[PDB]
């Protein structure tokens, strides 16, 4: 049951990586490369960076005890984007499209 919700989480993350969503999901695939992007204030603003590849590693390492812990890291990834960037920034629009994909499926988690 907890195992079953974690399988749902693995399926959700797999969809977030699917080519269908790549046009807006790709900025979230990997840790933000603050040095390559020139984001010299990023570590002053974001205390706990998170990205889809790290979430994938933690799922395989069994670091999430249940779906709520998984969901928290996904929401942290999005919240980090909304916190760091101006609300009209293009990457915020991309976060919103990816968060729609996540939330709609996360809401179908089995009881
Ligand atoms: C998860 C995440 C959260 N916040 C931000 N913020 C941010 C905010 C701004 C700049 C930016 O200013 N980049 C300059 C613009 C052109 N230059 C030649 C150097 C890089 C910036 F890169 C990132 N990014 C994230 N990921 C991310 C990963 C890779 C890339 Cl390439 C980008 N670039 S982006 O945001 O400009 C775009 C996706 C709309 C094209 C973003």
Curated annotation (Swiss-Prot):
Entry comment on modification after translation: Phosphorylation by CK2 disrupt the intramolecular binding between the bromo domain 2 and the NPS region and promotes binding between the NPS and the BID regions, leading to activate the protein and promote binding to acetylated histones. In absence of phosphorylation, BRD4 does not localize to p53/TP53 target gene promoters, phosphorylation promoting recruitment to p53/TP53 target promoters.
Effect of residue 82 to C: In CDLS6; likely pathogenic; reduced acetylated histone binding
Signal peptide: none
Tissue-specific expression: Ubiquitously expressed.
Site features described as Acetylated histone binding, chain residue numbers: 85
Subcellular location: Nucleus; Chromosome
Location of the Bromo domain: 1-109
Coiled-coil regions listed in the entry: none
Remaining remarks: JQ1, a thieno-triazolo-1,4-diazepine derivative, and I-BET, a benzodiazepine derivative, have been tested on tumors with success. Treatment with GSK1210151A (I-BET151, a I-BET derivative) has strong effets on mixed lineage leukemia and promotes myeloid differentiation and leukemia stem-cell depletion.
Domain characteristics, as noted in the entry: The NET domain mediates interaction with a number of chromatin proteins involved in transcription regulation (NSD3, JMJD6, CHD4, GLTSCR1 and ATAD5). The C-terminal (CTD) region mediates interaction and recruitment of CDK9 and CCNT1 subunits of the P-TEFb complex. It is also required for maintenance of higher-order chromatin structure.
Binding partners and assembly: Interacts with p53/TP53; the interaction is direct. Interacts (via CTD region) with CDK9 and CCNT1, acting as an associated component of P-TEFb complex. Interacts with RELA (when acetylated at 'Lys-310'). Interacts (via NET domain) with NSD3, CHD4, BICRA and ATAD5. The interaction with BICRA bridges BRD4 to the GBAF complex. Interacts (via NET domain) with JMJD6 (via JmjC and N-terminal domains); the interaction is stronger in presence of ssRNA and recruits JMJD6 on distal enhancers. Interacts with NSD3. Interacts with NIPBL. (Microbial infection) Interacts with bovine papillomavirus type 1 regulatory protein E2. This interactions may serve for the tethering of viral genomes to host mitotic chromosomes allowing successful partitioning of the viral genome during cell division.
Disease field: Cornelia de Lange syndrome 6: A form of Cornelia de Lange syndrome, a clinically heterogeneous developmental disorder associated with malformations affecting multiple systems. It is characterized by facial dysmorphisms, abnormal hands and feet, growth delay, cognitive retardation, hirsutism, gastroesophageal dysfunction and cardiac, ophthalmologic and genitourinary anomalies. CDLS6 inheritance is autosomal dominant. A chromosomal aberration involving BRD4 is found in a rare, aggressive, and lethal carcinoma arising in midline organs of young people. Translocation t(15;19)(q14;p13) with NUTM1 which produces a BRD4-NUTM1 fusion protein.
Family of the protein in this entry: Belongs to the BET family.
Function per UniProt: Chromatin reader protein that recognizes and binds acetylated histones and plays a key role in transmission of epigenetic memory across cell divisions and transcription regulation. Remains associated with acetylated chromatin throughout the entire cell cycle and provides epigenetic memory for postmitotic G1 gene transcription by preserving acetylated chromatin status and maintaining high-order chromatin structure. During interphase, plays a key role in regulating the transcription of signal-inducible genes by associating with the P-TEFb complex and recruiting it to promoters.
Protein name per UniProt: Bromodomain-containing protein 4
